[PDB]
Amino acid sequence: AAKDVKFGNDARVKMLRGVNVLADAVKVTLGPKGRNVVLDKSFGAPTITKDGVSVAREIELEDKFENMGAQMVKEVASKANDAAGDGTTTATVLAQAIITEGLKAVAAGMNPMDLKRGIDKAVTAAVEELKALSVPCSDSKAIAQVGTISANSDETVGKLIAEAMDKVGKEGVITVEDGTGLQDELDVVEGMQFDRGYLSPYFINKPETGAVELESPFILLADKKISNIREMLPVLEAVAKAGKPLLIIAEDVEGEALATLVVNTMRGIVKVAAVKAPGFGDRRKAMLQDIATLTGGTVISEEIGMELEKATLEDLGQAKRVVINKDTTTIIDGVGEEAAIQGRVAQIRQQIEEATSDYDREKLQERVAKLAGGVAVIKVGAATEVEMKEKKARVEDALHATRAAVEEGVVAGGGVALIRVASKLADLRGQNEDQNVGIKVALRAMEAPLRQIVLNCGEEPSVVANTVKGGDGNYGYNAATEEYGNMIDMGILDPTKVTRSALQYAASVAGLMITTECMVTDLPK
Amino acid sequence: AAKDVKFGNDARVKMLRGVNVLADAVKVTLGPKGRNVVLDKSFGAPTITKDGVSVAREIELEDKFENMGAQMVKEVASKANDAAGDGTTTATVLAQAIITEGLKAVAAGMNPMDLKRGIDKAVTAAVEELKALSVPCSDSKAIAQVGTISANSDETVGKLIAEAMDKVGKEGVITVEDGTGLQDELDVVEGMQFDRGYLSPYFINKPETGAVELESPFILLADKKISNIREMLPVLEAVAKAGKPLLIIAEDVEGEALATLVVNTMRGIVKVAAVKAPGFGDRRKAMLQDIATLTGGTVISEEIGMELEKATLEDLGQAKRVVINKDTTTIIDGVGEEAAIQGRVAQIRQQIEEATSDYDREKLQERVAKLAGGVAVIKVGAATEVEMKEKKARVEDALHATRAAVEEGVVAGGGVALIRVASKLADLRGQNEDQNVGIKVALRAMEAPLRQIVLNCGEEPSVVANTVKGGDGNYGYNAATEEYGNMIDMGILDPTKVTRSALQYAASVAGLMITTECMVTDLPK
Amino acid sequence: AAKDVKFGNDARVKMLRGVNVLADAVKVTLGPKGRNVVLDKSFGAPTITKDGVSVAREIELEDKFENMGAQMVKEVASKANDAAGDGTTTATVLAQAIITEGLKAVAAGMNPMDLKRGIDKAVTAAVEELKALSVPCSDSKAIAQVGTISANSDETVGKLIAEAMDKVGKEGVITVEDGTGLQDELDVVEGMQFDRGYLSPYFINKPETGAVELESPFILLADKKISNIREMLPVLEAVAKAGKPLLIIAEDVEGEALATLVVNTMRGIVKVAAVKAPGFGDRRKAMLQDIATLTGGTVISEEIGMELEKATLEDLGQAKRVVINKDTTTIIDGVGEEAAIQGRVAQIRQQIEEATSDYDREKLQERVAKLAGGVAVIKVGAATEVEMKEKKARVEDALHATRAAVEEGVVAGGGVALIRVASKLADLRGQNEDQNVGIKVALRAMEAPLRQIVLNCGEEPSVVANTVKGGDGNYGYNAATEEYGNMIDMGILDPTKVTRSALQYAASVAGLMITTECMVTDLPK
Numbered sequence A, B, C: 001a002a003k004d005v006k007f008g009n010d011a012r013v014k015m016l017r018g019v020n021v022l023a024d025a026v027k028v029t030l031g032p033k034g035r036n037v038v039l040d041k042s043f044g045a046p047t048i049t050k051d052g053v054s055v056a057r058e059i060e061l062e063d064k065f066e067n068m069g070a071q072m073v074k075e076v077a078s079k080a081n082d083a084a085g086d087g088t089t090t091a092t093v094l095a096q097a098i099i100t101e102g103l104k105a106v107a108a109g110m111n112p113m114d115l116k117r118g119i120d121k122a123v124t125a126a127v128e129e130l131k132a133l134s135v136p137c138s139d140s141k142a143i144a145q146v147g148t149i150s151a152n153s154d155e156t157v158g159k160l161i162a163e164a165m166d167k168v169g170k171e172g173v174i175t176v177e178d179g180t181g182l183q184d185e186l187d188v189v190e191g192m193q194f195d196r197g198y199l200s201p202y203f204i205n206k207p208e209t210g211a212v213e214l215e216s217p218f219i220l221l222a223d224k225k226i227s228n229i230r231e232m233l234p235v236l237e238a239v240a241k242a243g244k245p246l247l248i249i250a251e252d253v254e255g256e257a258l259a260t261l262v263v264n265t266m267r268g269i270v271k272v273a274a275v276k277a278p279g280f281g282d283r284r285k286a287m288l289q290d291i292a293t294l295t296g297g298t299v300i301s302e303e304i305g306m307e308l309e310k311a312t313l314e315d316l317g318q319a320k321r322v323v324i325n326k327d328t329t330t331i332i333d334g335v336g337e338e339a340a341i342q343g344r345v346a347q348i349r350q351q352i353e354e355a356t357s358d359y360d361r362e363k364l365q366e367r368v369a370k371l372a373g374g375v376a377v378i379k380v381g382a383a384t385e386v387e388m389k390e391k392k393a394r395v396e397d398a399l400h401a402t403r404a405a406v407e408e409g410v411v412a413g414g415g416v417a418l419i420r421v422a423s424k425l426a427d428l429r430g431q432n433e434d435q436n437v438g439i440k441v442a443l444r445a446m447e448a449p450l451r452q453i454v455l456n457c458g459e460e461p462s463v464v465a466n467t468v469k470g471g472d473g474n475y476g477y478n479a480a481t482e483e484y485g486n487m488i489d490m491g492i493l494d495p496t497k498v499t500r501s502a503l504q505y506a507a508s509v510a511g512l513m514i515t516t517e518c519m520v521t522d523l524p525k
């Protein structure tokens, strides 16, 4: 249809208004003293949250240009949430600060490209500075501490995650379930994990989590693109007879198959999920064979000559539980015999031994690692079901934070790590005046998180930020107790990975938005 | 015309809007880094001043309610300006802070009368605390220093005023005139000073100063009322023949009389000024006799039998120069023979000896003091007339500040005196929660001057105020150099009298405005 | 009346709009290729002018805020025109450039006071750099060259001015009149000159010139203020009987006195103009005695005992021509006997010999210099009266330019002197980022004159400016012939004084306007 275009400073001010609205709405809820925010609900009373993810999710503006600006910031913030699992509102606050200052400078008659270059130089120097400031978190004591502080200062969950990490490994697979008894339960069973996402969001049976849970499902092993709906009618009839859910791996699934599966899921006669095949090519087939060994299934491939129509329930694999993430998959206790698993592990081990290519050897090594280590199961334990759900959520977010800290490290939280990095990089200079201005914009924008936290606490942000900058090391402000002190000693810690990802993505979106003129959008109607 | 009434919270918000407009307008120009403000000139280019008095002079609003709120704040600020000769902007800033906080608290359902009581208690404690902090300025060194810093750091004027104060005395009289040569000149001649103001503003021959300078004027002495214009027609004919200015001292001037004098001055045929007689009763007659001795005139009184109609030029007194301040007068070098002057001084001295009442004795003592000390005169010396004017203005404001410091004392400037007083009174408590809230409002409003100065400098006012409060003694912020340090060492000083008067008057207007409801005003037409 | 106040960024943008309108209107006419600007005339055909002073004299905006911003820029530009006799639109262009860039930077959150400090540092460095670049113009050849260039490339006027300034002196006084003969003639006669201006603009009888010519007038020498009209009644009757315009030289003129004189001049019965007395004190009295010797008049002083009423026509002084410039006076061929003039010169010479004070000795030197050198008189010669007027104007403006060049020097014109100065100061830095940016704004604003000239020529301004910057010395762009080359070789030159004054005044107004917030003005009615 007809499209209204807007280029020049008016496009920038529209984008600024949109990001200002979104950033205010989501930054009000930053820190431990985060002020509540109320989201309208269609039916019933409104929900009340301090989680910035929900606030961002429920933001879109009436004006088209402001809405697109807000949507850009929202998308990059959600990307940051996906990368590290936390620091969404920190990313949005950093983005708002950098964009506000950068667009102000651009309106001040400066070159957008040089500003973006200066900001990029500043942020990469800041990233390597964070890596310098990073403190390793390999010891189980710090693992327990970070798990504790992530889960609202609960030592039991920190202990549980520490034991699970020791049991499986540093880079192992950890999952959380519900336990019958009041006592917490831990057990390690042969499982699976590969990074692939669901084909359509509609497969999510629990939207509040964004995943699926399929108790004792059949898993279908396919190496051929899903072309026609006629290929999986016999298996659909079989699973309808079984009255037990189903999951599908495939090289790809075409749009008509997506529509058919969505229709079947809303119908509810069969609950089926589908996910992209892992790996690529010959190794995709190798790990499909690994999954066949796990679940007792069989790979169905056109090259072999097998067809999906002639598939029996025995040919299908099974597990006792499967969970799909937005961009990951996990299978727990494939029914396949463990002796066959050991044989396959040995076979891939000799494949590693004969391997000469370094990267192929890396794929084989990670394959044997994921095929031997398996998965961990941490069944939460308490009395009532409401506390089952809340403690399960606490375990989930603590696990995310702890693994993020393990991957890269852990730095002084409360926004003090960025303050220290900015103070360290005070002497950085670019190739001209505009790059210098961009670098200074980045440096003064990295102080946004601490200032916003202090403002939420109600104290004067300028005074607290100046005092924190005056100090050195990890000396910082405690929002909870409103007392200064070494942040590590008082246990306020966040992963290096989350802060790095939030900073990098905020810088990326700010650079992208600074150098934008044209705004093509639908005519308001 | 009809009159509409607005009472309740709407009256308060209208008042707050008006005082906010006036306070912004005048406070932008506070301190050494005061931002310029440009004003209206109907004919010609606009004028620019950093002098807050000029800004407040030109502020009146469209809406009647806001206009009268601004007029009240302007009136009390000008009263402060008249009391101590400085601190108008400080007074307005304090008034705005106290009024804003007090009305915000009154909107919170607190009792206005208790808030006023708390503010009054806080300001009385503050005034006695200032008197505690006050440093004497008796030595001529501090006199020179304060004169120097008052006159844009000019040591010559400080030296001049130091010598003048040494010569004429601590509480003597000092005047400033234009000198002939480039060298500064000083002389002392028998004179006069009594506290009375002009009857109408229209007599001001130089509106930019507010005084009435008269070169070689004839002073006429009258003791009774000015009833009819027929009484001084021969006087007007004689002075017109003389072609020289005239001044009239009388018990009082009627409305018709001052109307005709204004008309004649507008005509320009006779340059006549009117001022009320000094003293009271038989003491008034005694000082009129003193003035007769000073100027060689003769007191005209109906009780004696003499009349104003039978006035001859010989009976008229004369002086070399007379200046009529808004609320003071000064006669310099009375033509009257000095022999009679010391005769009268001796006579009033023997009157002092026989005096029994302490009040009459004090009046006689001050009479002999003014009759013997006379008036010192300081003539400014330079090459050009523009520097004549500017240096004369510098000497005027410098001697105003110096006498203000001499009367009471001198405290650390830059708004740090009020900061220290507020920090000292942090433990002051009232009789009930509302009084305590009022006291805290006053104390937190005492930090307005320093905060505004820092904001004008462009720095973060919160950080600087916190740093200054953290320090003790006279540690403070230097606006000019933007460096901390002992204010007295860097010479930033202001009289205790000006700060005390500004604080007291701001508190008075704020209390009187907090407890107001009914805004009776004319309809907008 | 009620005055509305506007403060913050809205005040600045309104001022920017006003100065933009004025600057466009007046800068369109800059340079030899200045595009015509046709004003409006109430009666008759419109006037068409490329003269910046003429066009800028009329722009006043309908909106109050824009109007006063334009009035400020117009006032400072007219001050620049008064200082050096030229450089109006150059000053306005510089002011517009600095204002635009400075307010653009202030909108970028930067500290206005630091910006003003940086601009002031840049402009003072630029001024001393101009003084470094200055070339002396003492040789008569360059004097004739600059006179020729100023007067639309006329060699005769250059020859005349060079001859006259050789005859009288380098720092003499030169006047232009009309001559009967077609041949140009020059003669020097005893005269007088002192820097004082008319009391009322209404005294101007030829508004297009700004002064009043008096043919064979009487001059009334007075020492006191003219208190009453009755003092000047007998002399007014005498001069009315004489049927000749009168001059009044006196210590001061009152408001009533000048109102009466304006009324009398509008009546036309007496053509009287009044001017404030020169010098000060005893120096004033001495130079009035000199004037008495020059004109054969007599000093009237109350201290001596003489009065203005008892003034006879014999007591009056005489001359044969008098011109009252806006801030200068000049009388030609005082009737006073030359022997008395020589005696007075000798007397002041012995006063010089006995003088010990340096400044009084300088005053006596300048007194004898003006009393002995006299005045140069150059009467223009041609056929018709239209060319009388145009060549007289050419001689006047060429004389202004030549004397301005003589006072200070002469640098390469075409706006290239400012370009070279800016290129020389590229490494100048302030005390922080804000001052650096202010300095850069000042430097990049000094390329505005050349860019505007080139844009008026129709070429690409950036290309020509870059080419000129690439060159060194006086290499530049010739607007008239379109070709590059050494400026001094082509002869087009600008006095150092005019460029320095325009730059300084533009910087002063820009600093004064950058630090402005509040805009109090009459409510639009």
Ligand SMILES: Nc1ncnc2c1ncn2[C@@H]1O[C@H](COP(=O)(O)OP(=O)(O)OP(O)(O)=S)[C@@H](O)[C@H]1O
Pocket: A029, A030, A031, A032, A034, A051, A052, A053, A086, A087, A088, A089, A090, A413, A414, A415, A453, A477, A478, A479, A480, A481, A492, A493, A494
């Ligand atoms: N007691 C504390 N004092 C100061 N800062 C704290 C404290 N506890 C946590 N923080 C910091 O507050 C920030 C929390 O960021 P938020 O994004 O508001 O919450 P979150 O835990 O990151 O979950 P998200 O990102 O909103 S989904 C992190 O930078 C923490 O390091």
Ligand SMILES: Nc1ncnc2c1ncn2[C@@H]1O[C@H](COP(=O)(O)OP(=O)(O)OP(O)(O)=S)[C@@H](O)[C@H]1O
Pocket: B029, B030, B031, B032, B034, B050, B051, B052, B053, B086, B087, B088, B089, B090, B412, B413, B414, B415, B449, B453, B477, B478, B479, B480, B481, B492, B493, B494
């Ligand atoms: N160098 C300085 N640093 C800090 N404060 C200063 C400095 N010089 C003066 N002050 C303070 O600033 C105030 C003087 O500025 P203003 O009060 O705005 O003007 P003023 O000279 O007092 O006359 P006004 O405008 O009629 S009040 C006083 O409170 C001084 O103590």
Ligand SMILES: Nc1ncnc2c1ncn2[C@@H]1O[C@H](COP(=O)(O)OP(=O)(O)OP(O)(O)=S)[C@@H](O)[C@H]1O
Pocket: C029, C030, C031, C032, C034, C051, C052, C053, C086, C087, C088, C089, C090, C091, C412, C413, C414, C415, C449, C453, C477, C478, C479, C480, C481, C492, C493, C494
């Ligand atoms: N032939 C020329 N080529 C280039 N620049 C020239 C030339 N003649 C004069 N100029 C410049 O033009 C400016 C003078 O402005 P003009 O408006 O053209 O004339 P003007 O009225 O004498 O000067 P103004 O109005 O005070 S700026 C100066 O900067 C001169 O150096």
